[PDB]
Design a protein around this ligand. Structure first.
Ligand SMILES: *C(=O)c1cc(N)ccc1[C@H](*)C(=O)OCCBr
Ligand SMILES: [Ca+2]
Length: 240
């Protein structure tokens, strides 16, 4: 997260750290959302490589023991059938992971609330992006969970030539574009928490930013619109 603020230890209990075995250690790669006690939702592109993955729940500080962490391995990876590595602008940037075991729910570990199917937020809706991604373009990963206020940009605007143009689709969500705040590398797969009817819900999955940089004016952070995959999500969990 670029231009964000350190998040409170118990503000976003649904946030997870997706890591992969690196030699003799683990390294944060993506964010994700705990949707089930044994299911996590992330970005497809996060699990494109064939590495060993593990999920860290109740995580706050990557390089420090918070006394709240729960480490679980990934048992099964279910990417979206229409997903294609070479075409991120195509969509379908979503994957469901089945955890080896069920995590213990508590103050730091909670299930993310999903939006109802077909739900579209109005322009300039109140949202927050969370993650441990790069704090600066081409910078380094954040040690502690960061957060940034990211109002949404409606399809009509986001799809305009001055913005993302045709690169973006109706099955995506735009947020930010102020040239100051945004998602960055390592934040993707993570949640986009939006306040609807007094309650925060996960309306998107961090997908992509511009090749130019993370924080670029008129280049909002792009997310996979979760409300577009409700049916799919339910079908996967019920069958696996
Ligand atoms: C976000 O999920 C993410 C995280 C990492 N570490 C690498 C890539 C991605 C998504 C993406 O499309 O960015 C390409 C890397 Br310039
Ligand atoms: Ca920790």
């Amino acid at each position: 997260v670029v231009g964000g603020t350190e998040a409170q230890r118990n503000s976003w209990p649904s946030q997870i750290s997706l890591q992969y075995r690196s030699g003799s250690s683990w390294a944060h790669t993506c964010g994700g959302t705990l949707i089930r006690q044994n299911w996590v939702m992330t970005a497809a592109h996060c699990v494109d490589r064939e590495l060993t993955f593990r999920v860290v729940v109740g995580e706050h500080n990557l390089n420090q023991n918070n006394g709240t962490e729960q480490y679980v391995g990934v048992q099964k990876i279910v990417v979206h059938p229409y997903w294609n590595t070479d075409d991120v602008a195509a969509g379908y940037d979503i994957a469901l992971l089945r955890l080896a075991q069920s995590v213990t729910l508590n103050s730091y570990v909670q299930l993310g609330v999903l939006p109802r199917a077909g739900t579209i937020l109005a322009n300039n809706s109140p949202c927050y992006i969370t993650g441990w991604g790069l704090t600066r373009t081409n910078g380094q990963l954040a040690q502690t969970l960061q957060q940034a206020y990211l109002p949404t940009v409606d399809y009509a605007i986001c799809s305009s030539s001055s913005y993302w143009g045709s690169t973006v689709k109706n099955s995506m969500v735009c947020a930010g574009g102020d040239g100051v705040r945004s998602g960055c590398q390592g934040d993707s797969g993570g949640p986009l928490h939006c306040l609807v009817n007094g309650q925060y819900a996960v309306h998107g999955v961090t997908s992509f930013v511009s090749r130019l940089g993370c924080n670029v004016t008129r280049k909002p952070t792009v997310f996979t619109r979760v409300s577009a995959y409700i049916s799919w999500i339910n079908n996967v969990i019920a069958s696996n």
